[PDB]
Amino acid sequence: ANFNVAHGLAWSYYIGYLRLILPGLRARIQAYNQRHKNVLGGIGNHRLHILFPLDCGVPDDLSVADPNIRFLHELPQQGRVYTNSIYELLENGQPAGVCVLEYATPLQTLFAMSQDGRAGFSREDRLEQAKLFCRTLEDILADAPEAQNNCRLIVYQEPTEGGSFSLSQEILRHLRQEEREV
Amino acid sequence: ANFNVAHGLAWSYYIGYLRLILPGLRARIQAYNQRHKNVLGGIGNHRLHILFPLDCGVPDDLSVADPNIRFLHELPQQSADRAGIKGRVYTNSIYELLENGQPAGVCVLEYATPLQTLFAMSQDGRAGFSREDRLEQAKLFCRTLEDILADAPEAQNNCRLIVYQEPTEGGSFSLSQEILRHLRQEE
Ligand SMILES: Nc1nc2c(ncn2[C@@H]2O[C@@H]3COP(=O)(O)O[C@H]4[C@@H](O)[C@H](n5cnc6c(=O)[nH]c(N)nc65)O[C@@H]4COP(=O)(O)O[C@H]3[C@H]2O)c(=O)[nH]1
């Protein structure tokens, strides 16, 4: 079995998803702000933030396990449906940020492959595939400049949940980086 | 520009879709029948039928592809929290297959979506990915996925892969007939 999947994962994720949703994301965020203007407040950061745990451990629990990352509200679409997610970030127990946030789902493909009990695909093979996946997507996004102005990758080595690594602080650092550039 | 994507497409389609959708499919079909069999009619075949056109872009819609394929009804949706998305929707449709202007078959039917990904890749103006490349990647995608399913017996028993060529001078191939032949063999 050939386990060189990273190129397929990167082009699939770009062609089948990021290429399709990134052009209209800003307008959907702006619409949401306007719909909820006097009530729910405004999301100022208009980029999709894509979490990329190199260990490929991607949770499906909407981060309820991490009390400093909380699901706020769906970002509605615009019968296969493409919606996104607004999350609140907390710091020292207090609200600290709000952004459109999600995980790179194809990392879960890499995880299952290393966890499925087949022979030639270890945790070590997985990490090299995750890195190649990451690098290929970045190279792709680096030639689709309308997409990379709408999208930021948050790449990190630690477990997304558990231990002393704070994913919330990591995201917040990226939000402040982006705030600086605009 | 490295466009060897087929192996990744197959693993992605298996883990990210087939492994997730097939275990609950029979229960959704049973719910469909419980709600509709006494009026609209029920479905006897409980398997997902997945179409793999090797040498033509996946049509935008199955009735456009063949006038003898008619949309019947959607199954109850499958909703799930997925990688930060609340209630991501996975949906499947039942179609009627017509023969001599009469429904002759009914089943849960869809195209293999990675073949749409390959088609899109071939139409984006990028150099080094011709229709020839697309066709080779489509066959390798199909082969690898069947390779994977051969070690996944429950998944193999819950879906049927309908793999076919299509003539590009046309007229000598009916897609409904091709699906009907498979349905009649399953029984
Ligand atoms: N929030 C959100 N993200 C999305 C949606 N669709 C695609 N993506 C993202 O883009 C990746 C690639 O999509 P793909 O090219 O269609 O490639 C997909 C596709 O070929 C198949 N697949 C996934 N979902 C569906 C589905 O609802 N229906 C069908 N027929 N196939 C699906 O499995 C492949 C891998 O799926 P994933 O592992 O999930 O990985 C997906 C996922 O990360 C969506 O509707 N909502």
CSV table of C-alpha atoms and ligand atoms in Angstrom, one decimal:
chain,number,residue,atom,x,y,z
A,1,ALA,CA,0.0,0.0,0.0
A,2,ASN,CA,1.2,3.5,-1.0
A,3,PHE,CA,0.9,5.8,2.0
A,4,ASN,CA,2.1,9.0,0.1
A,5,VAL,CA,-1.2,10.8,0.6
A,6,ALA,CA,-0.1,14.3,1.6
A,7,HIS,CA,-0.3,15.8,-1.9
A,8,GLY,CA,-3.8,14.4,-2.4
A,9,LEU,CA,-4.8,15.7,1.0
A,10,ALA,CA,-3.5,19.2,0.2
A,11,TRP,CA,-5.0,19.5,-3.3
A,12,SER,CA,-8.3,18.0,-2.1
A,13,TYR,CA,-8.5,20.4,0.8
A,14,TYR,CA,-7.7,23.3,-1.4
A,15,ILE,CA,-9.7,22.5,-4.6
A,16,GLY,CA,-12.6,20.9,-2.8
A,17,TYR,CA,-13.0,23.3,0.0
A,18,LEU,CA,-10.8,26.4,0.6
A,19,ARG,CA,-11.1,27.5,-3.1
A,20,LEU,CA,-14.8,27.2,-2.7
A,21,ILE,CA,-15.5,28.9,0.6
A,22,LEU,CA,-12.7,31.5,1.0
A,23,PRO,CA,-14.0,33.9,-1.7
A,24,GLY,CA,-17.3,34.4,0.0
A,25,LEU,CA,-16.2,34.3,3.7
A,26,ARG,CA,-15.7,38.0,4.2
A,27,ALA,CA,-19.2,38.8,2.9
A,28,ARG,CA,-20.7,36.1,5.2
A,29,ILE,CA,-18.9,37.6,8.2
A,30,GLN,CA,-19.9,41.1,7.3
A,31,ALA,CA,-23.5,39.9,6.9
A,32,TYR,CA,-23.5,38.3,10.3
A,33,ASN,CA,-22.2,41.5,11.9
A,34,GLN,CA,-25.0,43.5,10.2
A,35,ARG,CA,-27.8,41.0,11.1
A,36,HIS,CA,-26.7,41.0,14.8
A,37,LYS,CA,-25.5,44.6,14.9
A,38,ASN,CA,-27.3,46.0,17.9
A,39,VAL,CA,-27.1,42.7,19.9
A,40,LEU,CA,-24.4,40.1,19.4
A,41,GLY,CA,-21.5,42.3,18.5
A,42,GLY,CA,-19.1,42.4,15.6
A,43,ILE,CA,-16.4,40.0,14.4
A,44,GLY,CA,-13.7,42.3,13.2
A,45,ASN,CA,-11.2,39.6,12.0
A,46,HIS,CA,-12.4,38.5,8.6
A,47,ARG,CA,-10.1,35.5,8.1
A,48,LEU,CA,-10.6,31.8,8.4
A,49,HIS,CA,-8.2,30.4,11.0
A,50,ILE,CA,-7.3,26.8,10.4
A,51,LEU,CA,-5.8,24.8,13.3
A,52,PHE,CA,-3.1,22.3,12.2
A,53,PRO,CA,-1.9,20.1,15.0
A,54,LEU,CA,1.1,18.3,13.5
A,55,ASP,CA,0.3,15.3,15.8
A,56,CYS,CA,-3.0,15.0,13.9
A,57,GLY,CA,-5.1,14.9,17.0
A,58,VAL,CA,-8.2,16.7,15.9
A,59,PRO,CA,-11.2,16.9,18.3
A,60,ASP,CA,-14.8,16.7,17.2
A,61,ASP,CA,-16.1,18.1,20.6
A,62,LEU,CA,-16.3,21.8,19.6
A,63,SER,CA,-13.5,22.3,22.1
A,64,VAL,CA,-15.7,21.8,25.1
A,65,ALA,CA,-12.8,19.9,26.7
A,66,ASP,CA,-10.8,23.2,26.6
A,67,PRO,CA,-12.5,25.8,28.8
A,68,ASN,CA,-10.6,28.7,27.1
A,69,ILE,CA,-12.0,27.9,23.7
A,70,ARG,CA,-15.8,28.0,23.4
A,71,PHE,CA,-18.2,27.6,20.5
A,72,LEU,CA,-20.1,30.9,20.0
A,73,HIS,CA,-22.4,30.6,17.0
A,74,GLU,CA,-22.5,29.1,13.5
A,75,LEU,CA,-21.5,31.2,10.6
A,76,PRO,CA,-24.3,30.3,8.2
A,77,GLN,CA,-23.7,29.3,4.6
A,78,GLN,CA,-23.6,31.4,1.3
A,79,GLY,CA,-27.9,19.8,-0.8
A,80,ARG,CA,-24.4,19.9,0.5
A,81,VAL,CA,-24.0,22.7,3.1
A,82,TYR,CA,-20.8,24.6,3.9
A,83,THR,CA,-21.0,26.4,7.3
A,84,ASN,CA,-18.3,27.7,9.5
A,85,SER,CA,-17.8,28.4,13.2
A,86,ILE,CA,-17.3,31.5,15.4
A,87,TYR,CA,-15.4,30.8,18.6
A,88,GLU,CA,-14.6,32.8,21.7
A,89,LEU,CA,-11.2,32.6,23.3
A,90,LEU,CA,-10.6,33.3,27.0
A,91,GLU,CA,-7.5,34.4,28.8
A,92,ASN,CA,-7.0,34.5,32.6
A,93,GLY,CA,-10.7,33.5,32.9
A,94,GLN,CA,-11.9,36.5,30.9
A,95,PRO,CA,-13.0,37.0,27.3
A,96,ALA,CA,-9.9,37.7,25.1
A,97,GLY,CA,-10.8,37.1,21.4
A,98,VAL,CA,-13.4,36.1,18.9
A,99,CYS,CA,-12.7,34.7,15.4
A,100,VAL,CA,-13.8,32.2,12.7
A,101,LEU,CA,-12.0,29.0,13.7
A,102,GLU,CA,-11.8,25.3,12.8
A,103,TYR,CA,-9.5,22.3,12.4
A,104,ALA,CA,-7.9,21.0,9.2
A,105,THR,CA,-10.2,17.9,8.9
A,106,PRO,CA,-7.8,15.9,6.6
A,107,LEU,CA,-5.4,15.6,9.5
A,108,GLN,CA,-7.9,13.0,10.8
A,109,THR,CA,-7.2,10.9,7.7
A,110,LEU,CA,-3.5,10.8,8.6
A,111,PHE,CA,-4.4,10.0,12.2
A,112,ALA,CA,-6.7,7.0,11.3
A,113,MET,CA,-4.0,5.7,8.9
A,114,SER,CA,-1.4,5.6,11.7
A,115,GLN,CA,-4.0,4.2,14.1
A,116,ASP,CA,-5.6,1.6,11.8
A,117,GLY,CA,-3.1,-1.2,12.6
A,118,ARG,CA,-1.8,-1.6,9.1
A,119,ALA,CA,2.0,-2.3,8.8
A,120,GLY,CA,4.0,0.4,7.0
A,121,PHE,CA,2.6,3.5,8.5
A,122,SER,CA,3.9,4.5,12.0
A,123,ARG,CA,3.5,7.7,14.1
A,124,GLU,CA,6.8,8.7,12.6
A,125,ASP,CA,5.5,8.3,9.0
A,126,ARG,CA,2.4,10.3,10.1
A,127,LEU,CA,4.4,13.3,11.3
A,128,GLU,CA,6.3,13.5,8.0
A,129,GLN,CA,3.0,13.3,6.1
A,130,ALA,CA,1.5,16.0,8.2
A,131,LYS,CA,4.5,18.3,7.6
A,132,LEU,CA,4.4,17.6,3.9
A,133,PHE,CA,0.6,18.2,3.9
A,134,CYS,CA,1.2,21.5,5.7
A,135,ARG,CA,4.0,22.6,3.4
A,136,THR,CA,2.1,21.7,0.1
A,137,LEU,CA,-1.0,23.6,1.2
A,138,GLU,CA,1.1,26.6,2.2
A,139,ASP,CA,2.8,26.5,-1.2
A,140,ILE,CA,-0.6,26.2,-2.9
A,141,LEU,CA,-2.0,29.1,-0.8
A,142,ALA,CA,1.1,31.1,-1.6
A,143,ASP,CA,0.1,31.2,-5.3
A,144,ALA,CA,-3.6,31.8,-4.7
A,145,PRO,CA,-3.2,35.3,-3.1
A,146,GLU,CA,-6.9,36.0,-2.9
A,147,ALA,CA,-7.2,32.9,-0.7
A,148,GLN,CA,-4.2,33.5,1.6
A,149,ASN,CA,-5.5,37.1,2.3
A,150,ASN,CA,-8.7,35.3,3.6
A,151,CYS,CA,-7.0,32.4,5.5
A,152,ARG,CA,-4.4,31.8,8.2
A,153,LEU,CA,-2.9,28.5,9.2
A,154,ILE,CA,-2.1,27.9,12.9
A,155,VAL,CA,0.5,25.1,13.0
A,156,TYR,CA,1.8,23.7,16.3
A,157,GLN,CA,3.5,20.6,17.7
A,158,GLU,CA,1.8,20.1,21.1
A,159,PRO,CA,-1.5,18.3,21.8
A,160,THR,CA,-4.4,20.6,21.1
A,161,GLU,CA,-5.9,19.7,24.5
A,162,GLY,CA,-4.3,18.5,27.7
A,163,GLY,CA,-1.0,19.5,29.3
A,164,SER,CA,0.5,22.9,29.8
A,165,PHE,CA,0.3,24.1,26.1
A,166,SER,CA,-2.4,26.7,25.8
A,167,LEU,CA,-4.0,26.6,22.3
A,168,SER,CA,-6.1,29.7,23.2
A,169,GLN,CA,-2.9,31.7,23.8
A,170,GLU,CA,-1.5,30.4,20.5
A,171,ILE,CA,-4.5,31.5,18.6
A,172,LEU,CA,-4.6,34.9,20.4
A,173,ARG,CA,-0.9,35.5,19.4
A,174,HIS,CA,-2.0,34.9,15.7
A,175,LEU,CA,-4.9,37.3,16.1
A,176,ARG,CA,-2.6,40.0,17.4
A,177,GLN,CA,-0.2,39.4,14.5
A,178,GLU,CA,-3.0,39.9,12.0
A,179,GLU,CA,-4.3,42.9,13.9
A,180,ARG,CA,-0.9,44.4,13.4
A,181,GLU,CA,-0.9,43.9,9.6
A,182,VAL,CA,-4.2,45.8,9.1
B,1,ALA,CA,3.6,20.9,-9.6
B,2,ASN,CA,3.2,17.4,-8.2
B,3,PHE,CA,-0.3,16.1,-9.1
B,4,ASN,CA,0.0,12.5,-7.8
B,5,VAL,CA,-3.2,12.8,-5.7
B,6,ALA,CA,-5.0,9.6,-6.2
B,7,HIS,CA,-3.7,7.7,-3.2
B,8,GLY,CA,-4.6,10.6,-0.9
B,9,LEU,CA,-8.0,11.0,-2.5
B,10,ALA,CA,-8.8,7.4,-1.8
B,11,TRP,CA,-7.7,7.4,1.8
B,12,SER,CA,-9.5,10.7,2.4
B,13,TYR,CA,-12.7,9.5,0.8
B,14,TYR,CA,-12.6,6.3,2.9
B,15,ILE,CA,-11.8,7.9,6.3
B,16,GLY,CA,-13.6,11.2,5.8
B,17,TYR,CA,-16.8,9.8,4.3
B,18,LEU,CA,-17.3,6.1,3.8
B,19,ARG,CA,-16.2,5.0,7.3
B,20,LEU,CA,-18.4,7.8,8.7
B,21,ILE,CA,-21.5,7.4,6.6
B,22,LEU,CA,-21.9,3.7,6.1
B,23,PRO,CA,-22.5,2.4,9.7
B,24,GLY,CA,-25.6,4.6,10.1
B,25,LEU,CA,-27.0,4.3,6.6
B,26,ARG,CA,-29.2,1.3,7.2
B,27,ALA,CA,-30.9,3.0,10.1
B,28,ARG,CA,-31.6,6.1,8.1
B,29,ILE,CA,-33.1,4.0,5.3
B,30,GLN,CA,-35.3,2.2,7.9
B,31,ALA,CA,-36.4,5.6,9.2
B,32,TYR,CA,-37.1,6.7,5.7
B,33,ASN,CA,-39.3,3.6,5.0
B,34,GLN,CA,-41.1,3.9,8.3
B,35,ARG,CA,-42.1,7.5,7.4
B,36,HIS,CA,-42.8,7.1,3.7
B,37,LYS,CA,-43.5,3.4,2.6
B,38,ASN,CA,-47.3,3.8,3.1
B,39,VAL,CA,-47.5,6.7,0.7
B,40,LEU,CA,-44.3,7.5,-1.4
B,41,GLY,CA,-43.0,3.9,-1.2
B,42,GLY,CA,-40.2,2.2,0.5
B,43,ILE,CA,-36.6,1.1,-0.5
B,44,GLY,CA,-35.7,-2.5,-0.4
B,45,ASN,CA,-32.0,-2.1,-1.2
B,46,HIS,CA,-30.1,-0.8,1.9
B,47,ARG,CA,-26.7,-0.2,0.2
B,48,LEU,CA,-25.1,3.0,-0.9
B,49,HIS,CA,-24.5,2.9,-4.7
B,50,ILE,CA,-21.5,5.0,-5.8
B,51,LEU,CA,-20.9,5.8,-9.4
B,52,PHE,CA,-17.3,6.0,-10.7
B,53,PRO,CA,-17.3,7.4,-14.3
B,54,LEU,CA,-13.7,6.7,-15.3
B,55,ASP,CA,-13.4,8.9,-18.4
B,56,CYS,CA,-16.0,11.7,-18.1
B,57,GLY,CA,-16.4,14.6,-15.6
B,58,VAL,CA,-19.0,13.8,-12.9
B,59,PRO,CA,-22.2,15.5,-14.1
B,60,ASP,CA,-23.6,18.3,-12.0
B,61,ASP,CA,-26.8,16.3,-11.5
B,62,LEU,CA,-27.9,12.7,-12.0
B,63,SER,CA,-31.0,13.6,-14.0
B,64,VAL,CA,-28.9,15.8,-16.3
B,65,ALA,CA,-26.6,12.8,-16.8
B,66,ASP,CA,-29.3,10.5,-17.9
B,67,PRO,CA,-33.0,11.4,-18.5
B,68,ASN,CA,-33.9,7.9,-17.3
B,69,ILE,CA,-32.7,8.7,-13.7
B,70,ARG,CA,-35.3,10.6,-11.6
B,71,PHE,CA,-34.9,12.1,-8.1
B,72,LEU,CA,-37.2,10.4,-5.6
B,73,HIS,CA,-36.5,11.7,-2.1
B,74,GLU,CA,-33.8,12.6,0.4
B,75,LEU,CA,-32.9,10.3,3.3
B,76,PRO,CA,-33.0,11.8,6.8
B,77,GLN,CA,-29.8,13.8,7.1
B,78,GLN,CA,-26.9,12.7,9.1
B,79,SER,CA,-25.6,15.6,11.2
B,80,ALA,CA,-22.4,15.6,13.3
B,81,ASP,CA,-19.9,17.8,15.0
B,82,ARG,CA,-16.8,17.5,12.9
B,83,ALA,CA,-13.3,19.2,13.4
B,84,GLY,CA,-14.8,22.3,14.9
B,85,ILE,CA,-17.9,22.6,12.7
B,86,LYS,CA,-21.2,22.1,14.7
B,87,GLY,CA,-23.7,19.8,13.0
B,88,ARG,CA,-22.0,19.3,9.7
B,89,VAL,CA,-24.5,17.8,7.3
B,90,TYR,CA,-24.1,14.6,5.3
B,91,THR,CA,-26.9,13.9,3.0
B,92,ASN,CA,-27.9,11.1,0.6
B,93,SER,CA,-30.6,10.8,-2.1
B,94,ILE,CA,-32.8,8.0,-3.5
B,95,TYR,CA,-33.3,7.9,-7.2
B,96,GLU,CA,-35.7,6.0,-9.5
B,97,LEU,CA,-34.2,4.2,-12.6
B,98,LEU,CA,-36.5,4.3,-15.5
B,99,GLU,CA,-36.9,1.6,-18.2
B,100,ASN,CA,-39.1,2.0,-21.2
B,101,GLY,CA,-40.8,4.9,-19.4
B,102,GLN,CA,-41.5,3.2,-16.1
B,103,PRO,CA,-39.6,3.1,-12.8
B,104,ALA,CA,-37.7,-0.2,-12.8
B,105,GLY,CA,-35.3,0.4,-9.9
B,106,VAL,CA,-35.0,2.5,-6.8
B,107,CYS,CA,-31.8,3.0,-4.7
B,108,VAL,CA,-29.6,5.4,-2.7
B,109,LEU,CA,-27.3,6.7,-5.4
B,110,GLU,CA,-24.5,9.2,-5.9
B,111,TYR,CA,-21.3,10.0,-7.6
B,112,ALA,CA,-17.9,9.4,-6.0
B,113,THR,CA,-17.1,13.0,-5.1
B,114,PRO,CA,-13.2,12.8,-5.4
B,115,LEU,CA,-13.8,12.3,-9.2
B,116,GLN,CA,-15.2,15.8,-9.1
B,117,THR,CA,-12.0,17.0,-7.4
B,118,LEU,CA,-9.9,15.5,-10.2
B,119,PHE,CA,-12.1,17.1,-12.9
B,120,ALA,CA,-11.8,20.5,-11.2
B,121,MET,CA,-8.0,20.0,-11.0
B,122,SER,CA,-7.9,19.4,-14.8
B,123,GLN,CA,-9.9,22.6,-15.6
B,124,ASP,CA,-8.0,25.2,-13.6
B,125,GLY,CA,-5.5,26.2,-16.4
B,126,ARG,CA,-2.5,24.8,-14.4
B,127,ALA,CA,0.2,23.3,-16.6
B,128,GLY,CA,1.1,19.6,-16.4
B,129,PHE,CA,-2.4,18.1,-15.7
B,130,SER,CA,-4.1,17.1,-19.0
B,131,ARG,CA,-7.2,15.0,-19.5
B,132,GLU,CA,-4.8,12.1,-19.9
B,133,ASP,CA,-3.4,12.7,-16.4
B,134,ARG,CA,-6.9,13.0,-15.0
B,135,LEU,CA,-7.9,9.7,-16.5
B,136,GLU,CA,-4.9,8.0,-15.0
B,137,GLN,CA,-5.5,9.5,-11.6
B,138,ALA,CA,-9.1,8.5,-11.7
B,139,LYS,CA,-8.2,4.8,-12.3
B,140,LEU,CA,-5.6,4.9,-9.6
B,141,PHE,CA,-8.1,6.5,-7.2
B,142,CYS,CA,-10.6,3.7,-8.0
B,143,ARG,CA,-8.1,0.9,-7.7
B,144,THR,CA,-6.7,2.2,-4.4
B,145,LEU,CA,-10.1,2.6,-2.9
B,146,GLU,CA,-11.1,-0.9,-3.9
B,147,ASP,CA,-7.8,-2.1,-2.4
B,148,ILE,CA,-8.8,-0.3,0.9
B,149,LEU,CA,-12.4,-1.7,0.9
B,150,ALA,CA,-11.1,-5.3,0.4
B,151,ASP,CA,-9.9,-5.1,4.0
B,152,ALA,CA,-13.1,-3.4,5.2
B,153,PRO,CA,-15.7,-6.1,5.1
B,154,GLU,CA,-18.7,-4.3,6.8
B,155,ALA,CA,-18.1,-1.2,4.6
B,156,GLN,CA,-17.8,-3.5,1.5
B,157,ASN,CA,-21.2,-5.0,2.5
B,158,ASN,CA,-22.9,-1.6,2.9
B,159,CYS,CA,-21.9,0.0,-0.4
B,160,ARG,CA,-21.6,-1.0,-4.1
B,161,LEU,CA,-19.1,0.6,-6.4
B,162,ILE,CA,-20.4,1.0,-10.0
B,163,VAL,CA,-17.3,1.6,-12.2
B,164,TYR,CA,-17.7,2.3,-15.8
B,165,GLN,CA,-16.4,3.8,-19.0
B,166,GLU,CA,-18.6,6.1,-21.1
B,167,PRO,CA,-18.4,6.4,-24.9
B,168,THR,CA,-17.5,9.8,-26.2
B,169,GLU,CA,-19.3,9.2,-29.4
B,170,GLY,CA,-22.4,8.6,-27.3
B,171,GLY,CA,-25.6,6.6,-27.7
B,172,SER,CA,-24.2,3.2,-27.0
B,173,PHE,CA,-24.4,3.5,-23.2
B,174,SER,CA,-27.3,4.0,-20.8
B,175,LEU,CA,-26.3,4.9,-17.2
B,176,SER,CA,-29.7,3.8,-15.8
B,177,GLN,CA,-29.2,0.5,-17.6
B,178,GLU,CA,-25.8,0.1,-16.1
B,179,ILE,CA,-27.1,0.7,-12.6
B,180,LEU,CA,-30.1,-1.5,-13.2
B,181,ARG,CA,-27.8,-4.4,-14.2
B,182,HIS,CA,-25.9,-4.0,-10.9
B,183,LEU,CA,-29.1,-3.9,-8.7
B,184,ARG,CA,-30.4,-7.0,-10.3
B,185,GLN,CA,-27.1,-8.9,-9.6
B,186,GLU,CA,-27.1,-7.9,-5.9
B,187,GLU,CA,-30.3,-9.8,-5.4
C,1,LIG,N1,-17.0,22.5,7.4
C,1,LIG,C1,-17.0,21.7,6.1
C,1,LIG,N2,-15.8,21.3,5.5
C,1,LIG,C2,-15.8,20.6,4.4
C,1,LIG,C3,-17.1,20.3,3.7
C,1,LIG,N3,-16.7,19.7,2.6
C,1,LIG,C4,-15.5,19.5,2.6
C,1,LIG,N4,-14.8,20.0,3.5
C,1,LIG,C5,-13.4,20.0,3.8
C,1,LIG,O1,-12.6,19.8,2.6
C,1,LIG,C6,-12.0,18.5,2.7
C,1,LIG,C7,-12.1,17.9,1.3
C,1,LIG,O2,-13.4,17.8,0.7
C,1,LIG,P1,-13.5,16.9,-0.5
C,1,LIG,O3,-12.6,17.4,-1.6
C,1,LIG,O4,-14.9,17.0,-1.0
C,1,LIG,O5,-13.2,15.4,-0.2
C,1,LIG,C8,-14.1,14.8,0.7
C,1,LIG,C9,-15.1,14.1,-0.1
C,1,LIG,O6,-14.6,13.5,-1.2
C,1,LIG,C10,-15.7,13.1,0.9
C,1,LIG,N5,-16.7,13.7,1.5
C,1,LIG,C11,-16.8,14.4,2.6
C,1,LIG,N6,-17.9,14.8,2.9
C,1,LIG,C12,-18.8,14.4,2.1
C,1,LIG,C13,-20.2,14.5,1.9
C,1,LIG,O7,-21.1,15.2,2.7
C,1,LIG,N7,-20.8,13.9,0.8
C,1,LIG,C14,-20.0,13.2,-0.1
C,1,LIG,N8,-20.7,12.5,-1.2
C,1,LIG,N9,-18.7,13.0,0.1
C,1,LIG,C15,-18.1,13.6,1.1
C,1,LIG,O8,-14.6,12.8,1.8
C,1,LIG,C16,-13.5,13.7,1.4
C,1,LIG,C17,-12.9,14.1,2.7
C,1,LIG,O9,-13.7,14.8,3.5
C,1,LIG,P2,-13.0,15.5,4.7
C,1,LIG,O10,-12.1,14.5,5.4
C,1,LIG,O11,-14.1,15.9,5.7
C,1,LIG,O12,-12.2,16.7,4.4
C,1,LIG,C18,-12.9,17.8,3.7
C,1,LIG,C19,-13.1,18.8,4.6
C,1,LIG,O13,-12.0,19.1,5.4
C,1,LIG,C20,-18.3,20.8,4.3
C,1,LIG,O14,-19.5,20.6,3.7
C,1,LIG,N10,-18.2,21.5,5.5
